[PDB]
Design a protein around this nucleic acid. Sequence first.
RNA 1: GUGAAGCCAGAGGAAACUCUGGUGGAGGCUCGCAGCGGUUCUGACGUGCAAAUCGAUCGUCAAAUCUGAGCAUGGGGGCGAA
RNA 2: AUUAACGAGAUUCCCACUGUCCCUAUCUACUAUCUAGCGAAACCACAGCCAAGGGAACGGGCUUGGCAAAAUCAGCGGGGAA
RNA 3: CACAGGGAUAACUGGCUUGUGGCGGCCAAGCGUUCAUAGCGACGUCGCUUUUUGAUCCUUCGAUGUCGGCUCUUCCUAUCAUACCGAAGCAGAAUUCGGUAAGCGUUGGAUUGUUCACCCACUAAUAGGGAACGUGAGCUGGGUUUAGACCGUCGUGAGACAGGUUAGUUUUACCCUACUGAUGAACUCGUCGCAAUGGUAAUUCAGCUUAGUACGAGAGGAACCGCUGAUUCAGAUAAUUGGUUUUUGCGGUUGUCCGACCGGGCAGUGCCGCGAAGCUACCAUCUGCUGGAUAAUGGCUGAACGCCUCUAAGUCAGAAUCCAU
Lengths: 135, 54, 387
Amino acid sequence: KRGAPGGKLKMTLGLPVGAIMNCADNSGARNLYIIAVKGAGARLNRLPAGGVGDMVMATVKKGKPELRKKVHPAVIVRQAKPWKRFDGVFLYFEDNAGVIVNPKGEMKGSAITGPVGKEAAELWPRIASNAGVVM
Amino acid sequence: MRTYEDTFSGQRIYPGKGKLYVRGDSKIFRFQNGKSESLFLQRKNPRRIAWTVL
Amino acid sequence: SHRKYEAPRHGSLAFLPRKRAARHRGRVKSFPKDDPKKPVHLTAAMGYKAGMTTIVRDLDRPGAKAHKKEVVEAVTIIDCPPMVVVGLVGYIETPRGLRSLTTVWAEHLSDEVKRRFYKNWYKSKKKAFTKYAKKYAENNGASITRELERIKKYCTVVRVLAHTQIRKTPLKQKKAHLMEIQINGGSVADKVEFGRSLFEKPVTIDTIFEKDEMIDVIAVTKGHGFVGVTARWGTKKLPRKTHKGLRKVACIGAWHPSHVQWTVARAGQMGYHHRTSVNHKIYRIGKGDDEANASTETDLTKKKITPMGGFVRYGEVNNDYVMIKGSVPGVKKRIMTLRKSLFTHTSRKALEKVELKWIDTSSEFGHGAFQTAAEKKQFMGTLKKDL
RNA sequence: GUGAAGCCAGAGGAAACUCUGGUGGAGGCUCGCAGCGGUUCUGACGUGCAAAUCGAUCGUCAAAUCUGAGCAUGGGGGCGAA
RNA sequence: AUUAACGAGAUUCCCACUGUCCCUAUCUACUAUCUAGCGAAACCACAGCCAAGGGAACGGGCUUGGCAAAAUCAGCGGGGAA
RNA sequence: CACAGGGAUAACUGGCUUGUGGCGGCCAAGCGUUCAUAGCGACGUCGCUUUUUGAUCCUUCGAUGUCGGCUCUUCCUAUCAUACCGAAGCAGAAUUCGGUAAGCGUUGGAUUGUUCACCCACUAAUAGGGAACGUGAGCUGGGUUUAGACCGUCGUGAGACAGGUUAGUUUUACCCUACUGAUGAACUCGUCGCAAUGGUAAUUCAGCUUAGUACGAGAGGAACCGCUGAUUCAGAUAAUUGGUUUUUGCGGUUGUCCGACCGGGCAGUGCCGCGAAGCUACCAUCUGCUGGAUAAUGGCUGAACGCCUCUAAGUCAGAAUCCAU
């Protein structure tokens, strides 16, 4: 089946195609270059975009040479644009980060550095079992 | 429902107002308006601002 | 040749004639279908719009993500001073439509309604219904009771004439508003008997509507002077290096259609149109005499719904009011019209029973921080002006 | 702004000659005002202020640089870093 | 065939930067707009609503139909094969 | 480079024809485990279209602005996806052929001036065409197609090349009509109402459950209701969050001027921090209804034809269709 989370409530989409975010695990990569979004629709002239919690197709631009020149799935874990939940509070992190995952959902790495958003933790069980502080 | 206090100035915060900030070192800051956070991100000392509770 | 890449059209042709509304007051076009087994009841109301505020409540929607948790929603406040009944009308069925054949008025009319029939009231003689009033107390009002008997005989629907008491609001205007409200009830004899008994009496909004009911709002939207295509319809802007303007439409038609067609976006007037927004919900009906109408079951503070410093560009609400979820068309001070719904609701979301938990009463003139004046005094301390 | 020949003082070496600090002020060298020119926006205007102008941005600026008045070359002829 | 320095010469890539773009929003000055005074030019067979037909093979005027109500203001760029 | 002329004569549209290009039929030798027609079809033969290219030279040479892209509206069906159905060498899943149907959609990027093409990725799907080969007083000027210059082949030479390369001015609307909005004479001035005709709007997917169930030796592996969300579109609104600053509102500071302090001028808004009000954003919030008549198809009673048959008379159900609310 195609990879797109179900039950995701609407939130502001902070990062479009072409954004470069940081990497937050010990896989060996240092940055991620975004090229597609899994749940994207069709509309003339409109760039696809994604937010915290949805899966993204990305390539690495700086890291171990074994990992370069390929295309990997990835999941965003924190974004730098404010957004609000149903509780009415606006919040935002300091930077953009993501992790490399299997298409099924398993993480390639073993540990996560820094905080993670609450929505990303709930949707993907594997990331929740590995992260530390949430929100 | 509960109320919080601004970290920088100590003003009362009611639901739906202000913002919430999470730093790289996993520290949590709360603000009540735009004046507080603009001074906080400017690296100002709250002990030298005359109208703060502290 | 064909269009290269496909795209949907801009705007909608349903609301096509984009001209200023013919009348300032909103107009109701249809009424709920009549049922002769219900008790007689009115089906409309009318009031003035004060402003908006924020509430907090917990959600009851099984299977949802936010189930049994607090949510924050926006609401709207409508001022609703009582109305006065003035008369009633009857209609008959004809092969060309409906038409009215009779109408009767009450003996005494207030100076509020009489202002409506004049354009220069100050220098007039105010002789509006002087000769009509003598029809009472003349042959024991024999002429009046004949017309009432006619409606019981030839009519099928009956409406009532009512007006507002604008003198009980902070508005500068003194001219009242008049409209017709249809009576849906058991029988034609019951309709006229109920309507006639209400002459020169006040009716409150709590008798018409009740809590958590799904209603419709009809009004006239906010106006803008004269706008271009980019903002009126929402078309893409032209490149930066365009000569002779870049906020236009590049091509407005082909050659042998040979005329500019009615389906092409063009500049003109925007706003001040008549609109009908449906499916709004009522959270609370507050009484004006109560001095703690803005309190809830968990928040026991004794306060009224008026914010600190009063609503911006409006006075304060001292009469009854209704709280409506969401937004409604119309600017502040404008007259609104309320109508019972035409649909049937079995969605399990419109059947929810709402109970509030907190109501915001902070100042909307700035970054307000306190609810009441007593609470502010305790936190702030004592000041120099307090002597 | 950079600092060419010439000159002064000290040090090393058997010798031939070599190092270090100052002095000096060369070049169809360089940044950059006035003057002279006219690359881009394919900007303004395009029955214009104007039968070639206006604004911002640009090239050169002590030398094959800019310029006034007097005199010479006259149509199959003149003059031309073309 | 190579080539240091130089170039308002042609081309490809990287860092910094940004409303070029996703996707648009707001503010200021002078016009456009209304008034008093002054006051031109291009152009013009007669003129000015459409569908089909036939015709010099793409009609505002002909034939058959649709239709059709004084006098007017601000914009617009489909047509008058302007 | 010039003059007198030519639509008696070419390069672009339009017109007739359709060889070539595209699309659709008829006959049945054979292929298809065996069996012409589930799905195909040799040798032959009958047609349609004007988005390919030719043939012709009727209309324009006292001029109809000649490639491509951007923007925006509408129409055609030879149907890519969606609704409901008929067939199979259709167990399930996945596929192939056909009917009613144009209501609603059909994308983001690397290289090329490209039309055309080719790869990466998303998606229910990335179908094909017309409107003077739609669209320059709408834009752009990369290509072609004036004058400068370079190379290769050809010419004794001036010079030639549908061979390559670099730089090259894009004018006017105030008139008529058309379109979008705004006033308005006559029957006294007003308030409250009816509705002829014209317009019309929504769209698709995913998760949970049904269920590791039906089906099958196994491998594999569905659907109706119900619940909750999301994509594209439309109409409003500003309680909260973000943007805008001539509120020149308060504060900080450089140069100069009023003898110093206080308070001020000038530097077309000197500059910086915060900034109410107003406007505003799928960068923010709210909302988007159900009756009638049918097409394809599957049926009932029932003759013509003593049997049979959905049709001949009559009649039932029925689609994102049509007409109304």
